[PDB]
Amino acid sequence: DYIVVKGAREHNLKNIDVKIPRDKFVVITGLSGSGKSSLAFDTIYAEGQRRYVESLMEKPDVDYIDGLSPAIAIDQKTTSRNPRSTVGTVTEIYDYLRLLFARIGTPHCYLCGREISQNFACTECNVSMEEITPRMFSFNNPYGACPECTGLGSLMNIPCPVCKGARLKKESLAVTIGGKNIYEVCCLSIGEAKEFFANLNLTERQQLIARQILKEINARLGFLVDVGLDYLTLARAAGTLSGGEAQRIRLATQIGSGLMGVIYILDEPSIGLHQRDNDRLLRSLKKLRDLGNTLLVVEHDEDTMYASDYIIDLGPGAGSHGGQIVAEGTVEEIKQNPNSVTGEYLSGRKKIEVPKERRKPNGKWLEIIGARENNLKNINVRIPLGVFTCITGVSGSGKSSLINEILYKRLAAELNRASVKPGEHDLIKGIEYLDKVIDIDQSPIGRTPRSNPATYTGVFDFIREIFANTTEAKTRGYKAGRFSFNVKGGRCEACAGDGINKIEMHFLPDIYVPCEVCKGKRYNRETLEVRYKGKNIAEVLDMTVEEALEFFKNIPRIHKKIETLYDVGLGYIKLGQSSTTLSGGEAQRVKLATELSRKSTGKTMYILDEPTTGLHMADVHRLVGILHRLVEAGNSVVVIEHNLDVIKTADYIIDLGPEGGSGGGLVVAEGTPEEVAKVENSYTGQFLKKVL
């Protein structure tokens, strides 16, 4: 009834031992980069998946793990996959729909529209119809798929002109239940479908024959609604879903499947979700646990902290300062623990203060006219310039589509001379007030070891210049470009400056090993002979930000950029770390530091989509400070956020809704957080009223 891990040394874990209770709601929390993600995914998930797959992932660095079970990890890693999968097929409701239509589906004629009762054919059009079977309605079999598009619904993309995307031949679409065929039922929203199936009128024989199928369909639709996805349609392709929607769909499917004795590892399931759905998500998590499963949730939400059975805290810091287990126990024990950051923030010792004065617009506005892409109901939006603006709303209200595909693409085309197709809108006025646009996300800053934070921030050029300015370099005639591994002359010839080699085995994938000639230093022996203040290029690159802050104190220009890197909380990282190994948070922080370093002209706009992904409360505090500094520098920041801590500090809030899917697309409230809180018919205002 326990999971015992001894000597976990994956990544930055400091050889820790942990005992995780089984069949409980266990939450792992800590600072970003503290090693919680390593401890969960790289150790427990990897071992649990390997021990099951090998009986039909790399082996983690751990002494032994006991009391393990097969592990399933749910994360935001959606893929396009295939066009043959939709929401209904993924959630396994299309199969039950096919069964129901085979059982009680009313046959019809696709030529005359009459009814066939039983020969099992019409006497008017002389058309013969076989007995109805569940496989007839499937679009993955030759018996039901539309022949032109072989059931795909599109041609490789344009809709199939025959079925108009119904993916089924005209013969199958004639069978209707309650006035709607299978495609028209699949075209309804999930809540609409649940209401439609709830009040269906049936005969005694039909009710007897289709009781179990109706019960299963109702249960699965209820699970989907409870997960917080009552605006989606069953016919929507699974490729077009976002990360959070895909994760919640997978969660609902796992709940509905009924599998038991499995360890579930969840990577922040509450991200991309409005605050009003937290209770529903927590109840769904508890329902999944009640089947006889163990839940490991990597979440930083306060409600998740309060709704958990056991909490494991990692820290105290991040990177080299993390990797330990500072505190563990129930929520009260965590709060009572003096040396826990999570307890410090929960107990109220540290908190984010509501500003007393807020910035005001200076008469410069960016107005969007006739925005009607996706579910936007032809609205006009005014975004003030020079202030911190937050875009809020329920899930599926169209805030993401509006912001991204009507603002970022249009501004990029207008200013950066980009070639992209914006969304359906009339025009935007106020573009002349800006000079450039920048979008910051969690995408990697590079795909090659040649790119590291030192080069990305531009401090490497100054480092090379000061290295070449030394007496030894001047005596030897070395130039500034000599100390760069991207050109021939100073880099190691064997590895071409990469520092690694590729070795191919006969029956194994290519393996990368450190280069033997340069020992991974990526520099020639002659160039490494030059030492500035007792350190060469290799030691300078290996140095962390904290060490480099003290090392380069004398030089002001380098010190400014190093301090900028340190302010975003990247003091634990080293300048020479390859961009391949950086995570999403590290890349985002590097981008933010680069933007802070540049001398802003006061005519730039920054767009961030859920910047508080995988960020602790302290990380959120630091990010809020950084964003406010960027705004005070003279630029404009627009953030799509669901976090109330970030929202309460914004100078302007735009709320979209009032619901999701086709029920949203309108503007509910706008103005300062107090003005939004004054609005009664707004969930964001209702929550802000309590928060303030």
Next chain:
Amino acid sequence: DYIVVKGAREHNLKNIDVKIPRDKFVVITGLSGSGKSSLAFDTIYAEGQRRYVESLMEKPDVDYIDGLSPAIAIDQKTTSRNPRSTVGTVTEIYDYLRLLFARIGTPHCYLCGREISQNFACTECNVSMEEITPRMFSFNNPYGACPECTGLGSLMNIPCPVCKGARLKKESLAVTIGGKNIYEVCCLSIGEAKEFFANLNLTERQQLIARQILKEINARLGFLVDVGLDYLTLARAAGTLSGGEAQRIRLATQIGSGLMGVIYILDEPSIGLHQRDNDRLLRSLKKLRDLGNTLLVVEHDEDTMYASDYIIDLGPGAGSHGGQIVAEGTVEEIKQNPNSVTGEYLSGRKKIEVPKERRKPNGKWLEIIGARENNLKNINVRIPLGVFTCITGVSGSGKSSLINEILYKRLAAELNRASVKPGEHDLIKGIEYLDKVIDIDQSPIGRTPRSNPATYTGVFDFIREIFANTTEAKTRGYKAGRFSFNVKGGRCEACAGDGINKIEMHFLPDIYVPCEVCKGKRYNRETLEVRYKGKNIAEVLDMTVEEALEFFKNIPRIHKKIETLYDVGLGYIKLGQSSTTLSGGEAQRVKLATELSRKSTGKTMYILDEPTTGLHMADVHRLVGILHRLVEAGNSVVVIEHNLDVIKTADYIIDLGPEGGSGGGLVVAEGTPEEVAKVENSYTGQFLKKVL
């Protein structure tokens, strides 16, 4: 705490409902073809595997399954796979060996043979050695693999001339523990390795640092010994193992892994195992269950019946007569059940009687001189002709290698003019006494729908002749070849007589559907118009053996072959069933019926390797009767068997041993079962003494 299956209709299951208790030793038994294999593998294993894999097999025909967990199926389906996997890597003992050698391995010089203590290098040969790491001993990484063969140990096959199959560079092989390096340790038998590690002398520091690794290695070797594989070597390639050895190795690995909350489905784990190892196998099964797992064992052994917690019986017959659940409960309840075949055989109501008179050799013998392949110790074996002979012995005693690769290949080369390489032997005398050799196994009788039991037995030609002899065929001028689907003229042109079509989907594997023109009848409309005694070719092919027995009563020649097919217990099968869908038992029975039908010349030899695979007690009784009939016909039958019921009826027994691996390869006892039972130092004799 239960598994509930409702409306299982896979294959021949008659819409049954079953409740399988969880975390118990449950045995599913019944006649061959009764649907037990379907109910287990096609339903429970398929659903359990699908519900786990889809979250990262075809969907069975079942209403719903409740209380499911991820399922792992262990069966005799060994594959060559890759040459990079051995016994040590599969059982995960090589990793612990590498760890132990990194910890306490004594370094050495590969040039002078001195010892290195700490610079960490020798001062004589001036050879530098890095610090010892666990990855250094692995042959799957560039750091330790021999460079010529990249760690494979062979060249694509001949051994690598550099490492001589050690798979490691000469630097790694210098590190020795207790006078043996890693390869020499891996070259020992499992029992030898356990004894070697048990009495290893170590210092206090070494014992402190290597306690856990030694404990784990000892535990895993003990698991391997308990499974009944104490003769194998850790360096043996996993490709060369037999089905039973691979299954038992997988079982030992699963026991050692420690995974819990998994449903294990085993397909007759006791096959290919001597009777003396049944207790060890049962104890291992109980140990695997005690970890918190559910066991579903498809076994026909009496000891397994008596050692189980719950028994599920399927029947009453096979094929169309099976698919139900005749009885269930504990062993005593099964014995008390009047309508259970398993209970009928357990209670002693039905049993196989020991013959009172046994056949005697007629002076004709087949002698093998100088057989020394594999572990055979240059022995001479005399096999009498004209009697029923059984080859018995413990696992790994070399009976299979001897029999197959010294007798079947040699006889095939001598008589059938086959081109194969026999094993290492001097010569065989007595070949002139035989005329032909035949080997009967469970391999399929064909890979195409064109081959069915009717054509295999040769009765289809007679059926076509009598069909063409009818008045309508004579009037229409139809020939005998017209009623054959293998030639043009009578078969359907669309499907070319196959009766199925191939349809390719854009993103799906090829799907086979029945042909629309002929509706799967594989014949032209004009040819189907000819009816003999009110039935055409399609109905004749669709008819089962039982129906055809009464239908063709008037014709004696056809009736003889139909009765021959019926006598092997294939009365439930139909003449038109494609050979692709036949199982191993069905194919073996078809081959036996074909051999019985042929007019034997009295100079034929039949070789069978474990014919009682997947056979119930009644099936074993029928097979014994069939084999005795074949012997009485005038031929010679040689069977490699581990079943005592078959053994006690044989006229001659040859016992090999006395142990497995390098400890066997000799002849222990020979003669009639009583003579063998008289031998004290023979396990087969010891068990036969109690059986008789």
